[PDB]
Amino acid sequence: GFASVPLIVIVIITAIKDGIEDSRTKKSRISRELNFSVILNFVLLFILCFTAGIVNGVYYKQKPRSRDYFEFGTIGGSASTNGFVSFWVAVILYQSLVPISLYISVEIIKTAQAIFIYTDVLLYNAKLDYPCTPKSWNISDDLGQIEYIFSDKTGTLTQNVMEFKKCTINGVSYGRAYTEALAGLRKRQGVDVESEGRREKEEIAKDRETMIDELRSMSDNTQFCPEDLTFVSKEIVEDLKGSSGDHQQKCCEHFLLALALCHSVLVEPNKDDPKKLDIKAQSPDESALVSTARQLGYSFVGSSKSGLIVEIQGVQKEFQVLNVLEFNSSRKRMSCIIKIPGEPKALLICKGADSVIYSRLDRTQNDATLLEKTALHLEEYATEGLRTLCLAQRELTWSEYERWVKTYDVAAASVTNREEELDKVTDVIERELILLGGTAIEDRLQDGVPDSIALLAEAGIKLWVLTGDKVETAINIGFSCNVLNNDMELLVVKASGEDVEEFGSDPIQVVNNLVTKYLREKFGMSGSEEELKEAKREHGLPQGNFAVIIDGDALKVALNGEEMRRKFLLLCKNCKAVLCCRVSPAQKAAVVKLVKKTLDVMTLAIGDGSNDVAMIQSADVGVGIAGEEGRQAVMCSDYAIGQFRYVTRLVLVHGKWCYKRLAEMIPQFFYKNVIFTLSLFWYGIYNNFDGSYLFEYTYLTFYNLAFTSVPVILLAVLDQDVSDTVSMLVPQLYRVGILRKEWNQTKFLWYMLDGVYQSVICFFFPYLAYHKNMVVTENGLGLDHRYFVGVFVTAIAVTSCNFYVFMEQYRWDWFCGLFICLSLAVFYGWTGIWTSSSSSNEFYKGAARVFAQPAYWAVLFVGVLFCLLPRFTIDCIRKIFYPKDIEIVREMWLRGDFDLYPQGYDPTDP
Amino acid sequence: NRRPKEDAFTQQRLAAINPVLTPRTVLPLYLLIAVVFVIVGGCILAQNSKVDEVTIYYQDCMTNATSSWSDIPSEHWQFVFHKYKTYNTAPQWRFVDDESDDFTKQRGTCQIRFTTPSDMKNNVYLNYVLEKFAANHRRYVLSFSEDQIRGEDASYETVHDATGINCKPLSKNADGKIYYPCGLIANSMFNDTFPLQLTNVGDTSNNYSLTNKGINWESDKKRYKKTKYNYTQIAPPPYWEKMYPDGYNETNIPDIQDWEEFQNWMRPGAFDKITKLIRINKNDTLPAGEYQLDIGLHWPVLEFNGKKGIYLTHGSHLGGRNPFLGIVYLIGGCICAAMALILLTFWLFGGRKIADASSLSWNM
């Protein structure tokens, strides 16, 4: 055949295109509705063929018709098997409504959309040289229905460029600084930020100059550089030698030694100057700590097999490292045991999370007041946006250390899931430590992230933040960006502190009572069985702008219990902000799966890092940021972009365009098939459904391939709802992609009904021009043949279908119009070419005979008019009287509101 | 590097126009369509009301006929002239039997005399109209060997079990021969022997002559070629035996290249009614007067309660008399005008600002 063989080449060419466009799994959301629509189309085919078989067989037992004299049809069968063979021939003729090219056309269009995504200049990060490469091609329309964007504070919102700014040591806050976060907090307070900011900046410059002068007068270092001295505390350089006693001096010395020693950074020589070093590490905070420790006087260089070379204010000595336990996301701490001489003792120093270290803190040898001072200092640091880091030390005799080493090399040296025993050993050795202070490191946001989040939140997306730093820094960063705007209150679900006394019980009851209360006074929503049914059905829209804050323990308890899970789900359905802090990667995956599975919605899971891959993999549209060395989040992702500032284009422009293009394609693809098969059926009401085919045998294999199959693909690939500039300027249009107000079964059913009506008009005009005398040839020679009537009907149907595709296209370019005219030209010219050939024996003169008849054009013009008149009239009395937002926006920017900004414009650009 | 190539086509910045159906450019379009289509419909009705035709059914010229000059019942004749709308003038019709032939189902001759009160210019077509003759059934239309039509002397090996287009039940006869024009189509030819002239009655000096040369598209003469059989392996189809009682001999082979009557019957009609050209006149105008036509009655019709008759017309540029095209242009124009007025009224009554920014779904 020719309706199934030429598709095998295309279905492999479309994959060769992907393979070529990749050297330089899971389905979409519309696919399920597509399968349902195909099933319903088969149902329509079956009912048509059933009616045809029913009629063909009724007249075999009728009056003596003219078939028993000239046809020799005298066989003892009329309905036992003749109806069966009539039904079979009817279905084999009606196979046109078996869409095989639909699953090829949709694949071609999705691949073309993905390629157009990959070749967009605005999706290109020049600094890193990484275009937006779509790892998965099937998901291109899923970007137009996103309702939740699960962000990640690791490397997406903030670049992993750590900057040491402050540090608390024995209750003294060494460090003064002023960045954009402090200015934002001051603006939130209300005081001036320009003059005060300039005064603070000049004071900071003076303090830094005094600090560097005192350091230079103190001693000399082989790696000192005045460009990497981001630490501006002159109160520590004086305390270093003797200037504030020895109790503070020795504590500061131990603090800086812990910073310089506890690390996992590799040391390499500088390319230009061998005396300079270019220490590199996977963890930017460790690199910042090592750099500031080296530049304050305690330099680190080299790597020996047993011990690390360190320079202390001039003296070059060699320590003895005994063991080191690395840093894991689920552990939130990194430790190392070394030897201190006088039976030398063992010194264990670890750095980790603010809460984890406090939990893993001894209750015997403590000042009983340094804990509170350090806690308040760390909270003050985090309030201004400084991700803290707690340091805990421990002294050990050789006996207990040797027993620990025996446990370590009997368990952590084994096989068969060693990591569990490694964790057991680490938690055994880290149960009694004394805090010796903390540090403060800050990192700025990306370029244009505040405006990107403003655009994302304005477009109805209810974005979440699954950060892990801590609650206060997350709140500050949400306020600095536009996740947390003004006129919004923060429902805190923290199960400790002040909200524990009011509901003193186990955390189960604490979170239950707190969530139930907040849900009760904030909304009339109490319930866990049926309110979920409204939540599922209403399709989602933010209202009453609130915010929710969730801790790691609060998250781990709010999704463990069933009632807890649905209460958390109903509570976190607020407008735009859900700040989940201190969360483990497993908690990230759990919350993403909760939001996705229950109340089925669309979940973007942008992230970066090897720990959040569980969030990307266990989501729907996993966007992977290409950031630091941890590129594992990009390979196991659905997309890949240079930095977060591109999502506001990948969701508001390409996603909406793709969703609208496919939602406009599919009903028209069912339309173009109905308008033909129903035409065959309407011819079938005559001749008593015996099984004659109205068109030629070569219109089965060329109506869905060349006549009217190119314009639909061009409509679904190269159609712009609105130019990308206006889509950036008016993100609210994306709202129609969230409420599922563009692709619903009512639209498809109405399109099929329009197809049936237009098939009626398409077939019954030639017959009405033939029924009276059937001599319409302007010279009486007579066409009279069912193939020429088929030419009439096919011409009307093809022209009407092409014009129907061209009407519903939002943007009339020179490409889609050219291919519509060229599709009409293909129909005419190929009828001419094939008819003037001996291989068209019966037909043999379609072009010369039919096309020269003025009756043919006189009926074609009216068929074209009467086919498009109802749809055009309805559109005119609906785009003027009940206009959607898109029509109003189009009218606006045609009037010349948005005529100032150029074509290559996006607000997410500094 | 890896930067994608910037281009007006790659960056989705193709030159384009974005149209919106604002009333500033919708009412003019509707008025233009309405005016154009009303003009064309009026022109076509004006040109089409002028055409004239004569339809005379004669399936009842044997059983319900007299040997004297009767009048056709008002249920058969239909004269349509654009100059005499009150012109009944019932035509006369006579039956002349022929007892030589033993085909008692239908035989003889029909003498149908009508009157044309006007003239038809330079082109007169006489067609035979059939009715209630199913000629579009699946088995009927797909049964005719193409090789024999092309002139090849194809044998039973490639005439009976060829592809979907083959003469299955009428391939070979009982004597081992294969029918030359095999198939249910050629076996069911129209056997009514139409004459070669409309004999006048008021002036016998000038008969109106018709020639059956050129009643089919000339193009088919490049497809219907003379056969290449030796008149020893072919026989006429079972329904053709009365035309060739002695079978096929060296001289009676029908040359279908110029047999236009048979060429016009190898295109089966699409619908139940059939109208195939059988006589043409291209030289002399047919002057107004009374004319006589003598028609054979070989082809039986009443067995399946069908109808047959003659259809004489000059035609026009859009075929015969058919008001459908003009009616539907008028309907299209009227509907377009009515919709234009409806939009005008609903725009002057439910008026609203055109670029109404305060009407968006999120601004309310």
Ligand SMILES: *[C@@H]1O[C@H](CO)[C@@H](O[C@@H]2O[C@H](CO)[C@@H](O[C@H]3O[C@H](CO)[C@@H](O)[C@H](O[C@@]4(O)[C@H](O)[C@@H](O)O[C@H](CO)[C@H]4O)[C@@H]3O)[C@H](O)[C@H]2NC(C)=O)[C@H](O)[C@H]1NC(C)=O
């Ligand atoms: C023009 O075309 C019409 C119809 O296409 C022709 O009418 C057809 O005439 C044939 C016979 O000439 C007739 O065929 C059958 O007629 C009898 C019906 O019962 C039947 O007896 C007859 O049988 C014989 O011919 C058979 O060989 C065999 O049955 O033996 C008997 C002797 O015992 C013998 O007489 C034959 O089977 C068709 O039925 C008839 N068409 C219709 C619709 O009834 C007409 O003859 C053609 N005329 C010309 C001039 O071409």
Ligand SMILES: Nc1ncnc2c1ncn2[C@@H]1O[C@H](COP(=O)(O)OP(=O)(O)CP(=O)(O)O)[C@@H](O)[C@H]1O
């Ligand atoms: N090299 C290191 N050793 C010990 N602790 C570290 C560390 N780097 C960071 N930390 C801190 O310890 C905690 C451990 O969590 P981890 O960093 O694995 O995931 P996280 O989400 O909590 C922070 P992030 O979002 O920056 O990855 C972090 O909150 C971090 O502030």
Ligand SMILES: *[C@@H]1O[C@H](CO)[C@@H](O[C@@H]2O[C@H](CO)[C@@H](O)[C@H](O)[C@H]2NC(C)=O)[C@H](O)[C@H]1NC(C)=O
């Ligand atoms: C016009 O046609 C009529 C009808 O055939 C012709 O009249 C017949 O002519 C033949 C030969 O001359 C005679 O044998 C018949 O007796 C005539 N019949 C009648 C009823 O008159 C007439 O001759 C034709 N006219 C011309 C000029 O050819």
Ligand SMILES: *[C@@H]1O[C@H](CO)[C@@H](O[C@@H]2O[C@H](CO)[C@@H](O)[C@H](O)[C@H]2NC(C)=O)[C@H](O)[C@H]1NC(C)=O
């Ligand atoms: C109309 O005139 C044409 C032109 O002469 C006639 O065609 C000729 O017909 C004769 C038959 O007597 C043939 O021998 C010639 O070969 C034909 N010539 C051409 C050029 O076709 C035609 O017969 C006339 N028709 C009528 C009804 O009078």
Ligand SMILES: *[C@@H]1O[C@H](CO)[C@@H](O[C@@H]2O[C@H](CO)[C@@H](O)[C@H](O)[C@H]2NC(C)=O)[C@H](O)[C@H]1NC(C)=O
């Ligand atoms: C071939 O068969 C045909 C059958 O029509 C014969 O034609 C008939 O026979 C006479 C000969 O006496 C012809 O002049 C006539 O054309 C036909 N008869 C009648 C009454 O019209 C033809 O003669 C046969 N030829 C041969 C060579 O046998």
Ligand SMILES: CC(C)CCC[C@@H](C)[C@H]1CC[C@H]2[C@@H]3CC=C4C[C@@H](O)CC[C@]4(C)[C@H]3CC[C@]12C
């Ligand atoms: C899209 C389809 C399912 C809509 C319904 C189709 C109906 C309206 C069409 C399809 C088949 C048609 C019938 C086909 C056969 C005949 C027998 C004829 O002697 C009278 C008309 C009659 C009875 C037609 C009436 C209209 C009909 C029933």
Ligand SMILES: CC(C)CCC[C@@H](C)[C@H]1CC[C@H]2[C@@H]3CC=C4C[C@@H](O)CC[C@]4(C)[C@H]3CC[C@]12C
């Ligand atoms: C946005 C989509 C849903 C718009 C729908 C347009 C189509 C489906 C609607 C609007 C105009 C409607 C047609 C208006 C006029 C006719 C002729 C009437 O005698 C029967 C109903 C029929 C045949 C309607 C069929 C359905 C129809 C074609």
Ligand SMILES: CC(C)CCC[C@@H](C)[C@H]1CC[C@H]2[C@@H]3CC=C4C[C@@H](O)CC[C@]4(C)[C@H]3CC[C@]12C
């Ligand atoms: C939804 C669909 C069925 C709407 C159909 C539109 C209707 C109003 C139009 C379109 C096709 C038209 C029919 C086409 C064929 C015929 C047969 C003819 O001898 C009488 C007119 C008649 C009966 C027309 C009547 C009006 C008609 C039925």
Ligand SMILES: CC(C)CCC[C@@H](C)[C@H]1CC[C@H]2[C@@H]3CC=C4C[C@@H](O)CC[C@]4(C)[C@H]3CC[C@]12C
């Ligand atoms: C033998 C054939 C292939 C010659 C080429 C036919 C085409 C190109 C020519 C020959 C007859 C011409 C048509 C004659 C009549 C009309 C009807 C009028 O309302 C529109 C123009 C239109 C439709 C002309 C368009 C061009 C036309 C269709």
Ligand SMILES: CC(C)CCC[C@@H](C)[C@H]1CC[C@H]2[C@@H]3CC=C4C[C@@H](O)CC[C@]4(C)[C@H]3CC[C@]12C
């Ligand atoms: C033999 C010929 C004269 C029959 C002609 C019948 C014509 C004149 C009649 C029969 C059916 C009628 C139509 C029936 C329905 C409507 C729909 C209405 O919204 C516009 C008028 C319109 C379209 C009528 C126009 C006139 C009409 C088409």
Ligand SMILES: *[C@@H]1O[C@H](CO)[C@@H](O)[C@H](O)[C@H]1NC(C)=O
């Ligand atoms: C002949 O036809 C007329 C009208 O068509 C009718 O009145 C008459 O009864 C018919 N006679 C016969 C014998 O059929």
Ligand SMILES: OC[C@H]1O[C@H](O)[C@@H](O)[C@@H](O)[C@@H]1O
């Ligand atoms: O004789 C009546 C009938 O008998 C047989 O069935 C066949 O020869 C038919 O062609 C014929 O019409």
Ligand SMILES: [Mg+2]
């Ligand atoms: Mg990370």
